[PDB]
Amino acid sequence: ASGVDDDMACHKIPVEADFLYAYSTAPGYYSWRNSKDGSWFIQSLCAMLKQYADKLEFMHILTRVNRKVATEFESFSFDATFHAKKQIPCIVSMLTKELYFYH
Amino acid sequence: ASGVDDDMACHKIPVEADFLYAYSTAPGYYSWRNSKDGSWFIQSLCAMLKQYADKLEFMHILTRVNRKVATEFESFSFDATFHAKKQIPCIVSMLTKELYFYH
Amino acid sequence: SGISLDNSYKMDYPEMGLCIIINNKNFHKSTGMTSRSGTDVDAANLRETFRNLKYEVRNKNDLTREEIVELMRDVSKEDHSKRSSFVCVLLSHGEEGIIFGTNGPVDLKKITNFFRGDRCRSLTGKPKLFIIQACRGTELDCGIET
């Protein structure tokens, strides 16, 4: 096989490559924060990092964060409009390799 | 510990939970397709699935796709504006568990 | 029984699920869009790939914006009780948050909403995968030498 768009002599990578965006919420949605304990996302992120950073690849850690936030949290508000709402973090990966905080 | 936004009696999950978007390119960018061999993304996705679906978790498979596209492909165009360009796929995960195509 | 962890989706249901492929190659002249040469190769590659993963692959070619919405609505109304997951591959021209039918754009959100946890109960708690081959804007990556 051969073509016009592969196996370049000079190796290059996208300037947008190797970025990872760990969003607290889905596109277009509000993000929740407990006025006393902090945001649902950061609470969960720190808990999962402390528990799995030396055991799991980053994407799998972030997946645990997604589940923790989605299952354990629900908003409480005197305003019915904002009461009993849910949240699901959003992992956006443009990484090109697996990432382990340990070696 | 106790609070107003956790450990609900009735268990619920976000309606936006459990979705995975495998985008061929980064937000705001063009996506490339070879008029003969197909799109860089789909070519790479199929190749990585055939080679790793029975061995790796889905996110790790998609990460291999990101690397394949980012390193192996570069556009060719008679129009300098569209020549020698790169592409990096974009994984957007709102999944709450690891996904293996095999069991 | 022993310790149960539940860290991965249950993928041992009787069926892996559907893999709907929307292959748009030819567009209505009235739209001014050009054909997508090579997309048939992608569609065929996908069918074979997901076939070997045991998915029920259903292909559709050159669908209008109305047909895309109807197809997705119909599929979301099916009983996915015995299926482990759902996959939808979209091959067409596009822009950020948009996928083009043969006669106009379709908001990706409109397509995915049919599968929301509360709108398609037989898929609640199951992975819903959307693979999108389409532009998300007009930016170009000049890349950098490694």
Place this chain on the structure above:
Amino acid sequence: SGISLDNSYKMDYPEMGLCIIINNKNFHKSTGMTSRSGTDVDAANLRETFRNLKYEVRNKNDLTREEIVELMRDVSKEDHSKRSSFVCVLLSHGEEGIIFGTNGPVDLKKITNFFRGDRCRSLTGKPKLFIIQACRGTELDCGIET
């Protein structure tokens, strides 16, 4: 030597890298934004968490849009040669693609561009992580019973 695969980022450089935390709690009255109660708990939790991961944590509180841009520009101009990666955590009010400084919005794109593969060479090929705690719109998830 033996077979080399290269499937994971090299994280054994002398330094893990920087972890810049931007903690915006108080906003200028002129913006009409309210304070973000509880954010200090997040900032402290992050500092301790990334401290144990061996990151060089640098915290900043209540930064204007100008200071955010200046901080990021300055950091991207540092020599990250001996660092394995880069981490930036943003805690503030926000909207899709936007993060609020104490006196106005800052396009996330403007912040991340400083770290593009071609603009920050000492991070080229290394993971650049952006953790964002902020709204991305005004939609609410009613959720569904499991």
